[PDB]
Design a protein around this nucleic acid. Structure first.
Length: 79
DNA sequence: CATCATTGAGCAAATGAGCAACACTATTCGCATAAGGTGGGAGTAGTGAGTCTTAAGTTGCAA
């Protein structure tokens, strides 16, 4: 279990540049920036929880959906 | 001697505000999306006077 968590932390630590890169889009919707980066961090955590590698795709395309889920979810109910 | 007004006394009829209990539906909430997308951006520019605080530079001075 601890080994698996080390792997998952390691992957998240890889994909932070992805999450700020997508985080540039929806900035000025009446919320602050680091709220977006943290929500997106949650979203990529969930995307790590739901990714499989034997599918054969690049991780980012699958991850994108969970990130927009977290962002648009968060600004949606935090209007 | 009779009687009634006149003071208590309480009631049915009626009604206004509920109550619980089921039963049904509107709304809300929470989860998903697969080729790929892996460092922000606005940030002011024409105050001045003072006062407290560090920080550093210098400088006697004594063992």
């Amino acid at each position: 279990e601890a080994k698996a968590r080390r792997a998952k932390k390691e992957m998240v630590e890889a994909n932070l540049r992805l999450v700020i890169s997508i985080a540039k889009k929806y900035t000025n919707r009446g919320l602050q920036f680091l709220d977006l980066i943290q929500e997106g961090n949650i979203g990529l955590m969930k995307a790590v929880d739901k990714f499989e590698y034997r599918r054969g795709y690049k991780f980012s395309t699958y991850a994108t959906w969970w990130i927009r889920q977290a962002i648009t979810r968060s600004i949606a109910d935090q209007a």
